Write a structure and sequence with these properties.
Elements lengths: L3 E3 L2 E5 L5 H5 L1 E5 L4 E5 L15 E6 L4 E6 L4 E5 L8 E10 L10 E4 L2 E10 L2 E6 L9
Antiparallel strand pairs: 1-2, 2-4, 3-4, 5-6, 5-9, 7-8, 8-11, 9-10, 10-11
Bound molecules: ligand A1B4U and zinc ion (ZN).
PDB class: viral protein
Keywords: Diamond Light Source, I04-1, asap, A71 2A, enterovirus, protease, crystallographic fragment screening, PanDDA, PanDDa2, XChemExplorer, viral protein
Assembly: monomeric
Length: 139
Amino acid sequence: SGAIYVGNYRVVNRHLATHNDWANLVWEDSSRDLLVSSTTAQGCDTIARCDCQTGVYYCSSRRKHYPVSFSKPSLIFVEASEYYPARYQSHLMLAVGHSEPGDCGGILRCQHGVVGIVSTGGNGLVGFADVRDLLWLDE
Ligand SMILES: NC(=O)[C@H]1CCCN(C(=O)Nc2ccccc2SC2CC2)C1
Ligand SMILES: [Zn+2]
């Protein structure tokens, strides 16, 4: 679990969005596994606007942060799960690192701010949904 809180927005994994997220929906994209809802309180986070390919992510199944080298956002095949049919997920970045069910929502950050959130994983890999192209999150 986990979310990004920026301005009057909450960014979560679409497959983990709550009834309240859907009732306050701003934007969602099943192909990116992202959903953004509106909040009444001002958020705690700031978003990176960069092309960093190194950063640090929070891994809840180890209660630890790990440094990672990650690929540029791209279209990657994701096998069927309880949440989605087999499909290509867009704006996804892979890295070698631990992740298991429950780790989605963990934040990936570089020196410039929040880059994205854990969205996929397995076999010593961890995949992050990028948020750096969502310029409207800042206004
Ligand atoms: N974005 C998606 O389509 C997600 C939806 C949730 C399921 N899924 C996924 O990869 N979950 C997962 C997360 C972290 C580590 C391992 C796993 S699955 C298995 C132990 C290796 C695909
Ligand atoms: Zn950066």
